[PDB]
């Protein structure tokens, strides 16, 4: 492929016969422009076919010198030319100061995701499905599982797996039993989930891999391999994954579940993925519910989390910003459904609240919905089709955060527990859950690390309600008052009539 | 001294002549008890006299060896005994697991402080009222600062000062203005700090000893010192103080306003602590309003904050010990006070309510307290007199969190955001804030990480009304249903007739 974009990937492919395990076979290229230098390894792919993938963040006349164990593939040499990016394709993300995220083109993100963990498992016409509902919804980011998933409600067996069979068994309780071949992958299955992985990447949407997971337990074993075996796993989807920019890994789905693995084991496989990894894609680990991993590891982009202890109120969200200094998300929360479960029976309503809380709070948090019908697919789990009712205020909310001129924080942290901050004189005030018809207007004077709100500045107001999706200009222009007990009032101490409703938020803006 | 309590203080002391500088003199011993060795710096307390401190941690049959750069005073041996401590001596506290805290002879220990920042820099009056204050109050704890405060309402100019006076010069503006020889301690600037961290020992007070603060900004300068001057403080105030069991380092108060210092500076000056302290006591840093320093650092044994944020709430109080897994300390969340600063200006009702917040959640909460009134001594930074209410029920909720069989943790972290265990069915549930005459008997089945709870269990349940400070017991006894839907619940749907009054605590604990 001799043209090719900035952060697309180029791919050398060689056909070659292998007396041995070609999943054993050494492979890799040195990619030179100038002064821009990268080794990337390759990997066998079935049907006599080596590749090596790379994902070139520089414009520019490239060269490449493939070393390999195998002699006809030692040595190789060509040219290929990089373009600049064009208008949509904005790279990888990347950690943006202590806080934030940002696009390599410079470009704001903000993750708003859902979850869907085995939905690369599930039978062809429910993956469609669930891709037609990516496209509708508004997510740029989805937990996904690269192993299948076996859970409560979750027992479809995958048509694809990640190795070979060595042999079928009758087991212990007289039924069928799959032997992997661990020494060698189906190329297919990674295939298909790359197939689906570059589909995402189209309709803008971050696959956040989870690399591990608990959710087997004996039924395949892919929970409990050796080390050993857990290495090459690895070694073998970053070299295929690496060039893809739309991933993030996620180590792990509730670590502390996994019981073949210490947190030394952990550590090992996390610096593996990291070694592995040519491009420095985010990386993270998610554990169960109020279990903090040592997230401080220079491993780790950032801090990805189950439990609703941070979002009950953005001030909880805020101290996790001072805590890890690094970006903070809240990727699981509870999901909106109607299970028996404890993780998966929130209103919509309470959902929509808990990711505004954080979002207002200064970090990220995941959705999710589970509404079990008959033997429908059930998302959060399976994919297939939104049920539920919060999915449409994330899509507004994104909207919203989008709109103001930077990422969002308290303005005045542990004494003002309702005022957010986009910026010099842009504020979101939470009018919180408890309804009332009336706001005084009311601003701290601290603004972050933005300079102090000054006198004498003429805001204007707009009622957002969250719920409804409705943006409502108020007619008053209020001025503000000197500095009085670290606040800020209106001179002729107006406020701004709202609805007796929760989820309202005011957007108080300048008058330009 | 040939016979010492474990943990009391062995000290050696020689008279010697020098031509020299004597705080630049090297001298250290090596303390054996058959496999406990132990070697310490030594120090020069004027008046031509170095002392060598130990505290032995081994009773048995000890000797020492010297070593100096004067002769005199080098391969110096002797002996003496240790006994084992007496019934009122438990040794440091240190870290118990990843959450709580022991004393060494295994007692259990609960900070439970107060903050005086500035007490040992008072007029003696004042000095004295404040050791009458610890006296009658419940505090275990105290925040203070080993240099003098410059700061709105703490203007005293202190009568000693850490290092001697190498010159005073009128000013830009008129005044007077002293240049320290910074080469040169005031020995009796720290002989008077040792003897009020003694006071404190004897009433069963932990001197939580700031080394570094911001308070000053020019008036004297001790918060710009050069690195050379700030470790040669640091292994000089090591040397005298590592052996008094009670004391805690604190790198900081508000680190992050010490504008002479960068985060590197703080990691050094940390680093020089730690590796001078033969003792290994407890040792944090304190930042600004919800400023977190890298507390995951092996060298702080626990999280010392300034951030009212955890406290608001229990549930996030318990979050914080699951993200450091090292004990947390709330040692500012404000003051009880009537100051115009939003610091000092807390209801007692408030600061009451935010200790328990933070207790129930499973950390620890420092109390303030500074009322203005005229001229007198405000609490926080100068001592004298409490003049608040909040410290009276400090001392009440003492003897709740010492009265229960384990420390404190959230049953059912995240989920239930009321109910905290100390044991096997042993629950204290807050009421909240939301003023009621009736609570249905509900708890969570998971317990922390103890059993689940029974069905068929009978409980009985102790109205504590933390304000009041009173204890009744309520005359119905509960049963336990069965699991339902993450519940548990009485048997006939009942409940407790309560005080329609915040901060009431029910404590629920089997028959
Ligand atoms: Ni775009
Ligand atoms: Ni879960
Ligand atoms: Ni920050
Ligand atoms: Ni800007
Ligand atoms: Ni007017
Ligand atoms: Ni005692
Ligand atoms: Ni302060
Ligand atoms: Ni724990
Ligand atoms: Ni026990
Ligand atoms: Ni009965």
């Not at 690895?234 to 893809?244: G, M, N, P, Q, V």
């Not at 108020?474 to 009539?497: A, M, N, Q």
Request: proline content about 4%; charged content about 25%.
């Amino acid at each position: 492929q001799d043209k090719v974009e900035c952060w697309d990937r180029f791919e050398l492919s060689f056909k070659q016969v292998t007396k041995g395990n070609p999943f054993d076979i050494r492979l890799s290229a040195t990619f030179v422009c100038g002064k821009e230098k990268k080794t990337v390894e390759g990997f066998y792919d079935g049907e006599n076919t080596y590749r090596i993938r790379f994902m070139p963040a520089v414009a520019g006349e490239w060269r490449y010198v493939t070393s390999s164990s195998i002699g006809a593939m030692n040595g190789r040499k060509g040219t290929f030319t990089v373009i600049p990016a064009g208008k949509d394709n904005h790279g990888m993300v990347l950690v943006d100061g202590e806080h934030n995220f940002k696009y390599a083109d410079g470009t704001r993100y903000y993750p708003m995701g859902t979850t869907a963990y085995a939905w690369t498992h599930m039978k062809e016409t429910t993956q469609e499905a669930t891709l037609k509902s990516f496209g509708e919804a508004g997510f740029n980011k989805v937990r996904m599982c690269v192993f299948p998933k076996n859970y409560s409600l979750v027992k479809d067996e995958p048509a694809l797996y990640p190795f070979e069979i060595e042999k079928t068994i009758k087991d212990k309780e007289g039924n069928e039993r799959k032997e992997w071949d661990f020494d060698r992958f189906d190329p297919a299955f990674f295939q298909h989930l790359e197939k689906r992985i570059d589909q995402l990447n189209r309709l803008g949407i971050e696959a956040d891999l989870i690399l591990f997971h608990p959710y087997d337990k004996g039924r395949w074993g892919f929970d409990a391999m050796s080390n050993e075996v857990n290495v090459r796993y690895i070694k073998y989807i970053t070299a295929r994954l690496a060039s893809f920019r739309n991933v993030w890994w996620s180590m792990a789905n509730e670590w502390d579940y996994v019981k073949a693995k210490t947190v030394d084991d952990w550590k090992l496989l996390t610096k593996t993925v990291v070694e592995n990894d040519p491009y420095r894609h985010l990386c993270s680990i998610h554990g169960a519910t109020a279990t903090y991993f040592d997230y401080w590891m220079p491993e780790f982009t950032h801090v990805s989390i189950q439990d609703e202890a941070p979002v009950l109120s953005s001030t909880a969200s805020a101290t996790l910003r001072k805590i890890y200094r690094k970006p903070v998300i809240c990727d699981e929360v509870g999901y909106e459904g109607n299970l028996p479960y404890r993780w998966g029976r929130l209103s919509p309503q309470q959902m929509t609240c808990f990711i505004l809380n954080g979002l207002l709070g200064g970090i990220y948090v995941t959705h999710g919905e589970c509404y079990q019908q008959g033997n429908e697919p059930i998302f959060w789990a399976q994919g297939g089709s939104l049920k539920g009712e919060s999915w449409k205020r994330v899509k507004f909310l994104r909207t919203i955060i989008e709109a103001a001129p930077h990422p969002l924080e308290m303005a005045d942290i542990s004494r003002d527990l309702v005022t957010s901050t986009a910026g010099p004189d842009y504020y979101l005030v939470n009018m919180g859950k408890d309804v009332k018809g009336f706001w005084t207007f009311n601003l701290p004077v601290k603004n972050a690390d933005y300079n102090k709100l000054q006198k004498n500045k003429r805001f204007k107001v707009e009622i957002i309600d969250v719920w409804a999706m409705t943006v409502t200009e108020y007619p008053v222009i209020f001025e503000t008052t000197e500095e009085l007990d670290y606040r800020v009032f209106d001179i002729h101490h107006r406020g701004v009539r709202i609805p007796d409703a929760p989820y309202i938020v005011l957007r108080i803006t300048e008058v330009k």
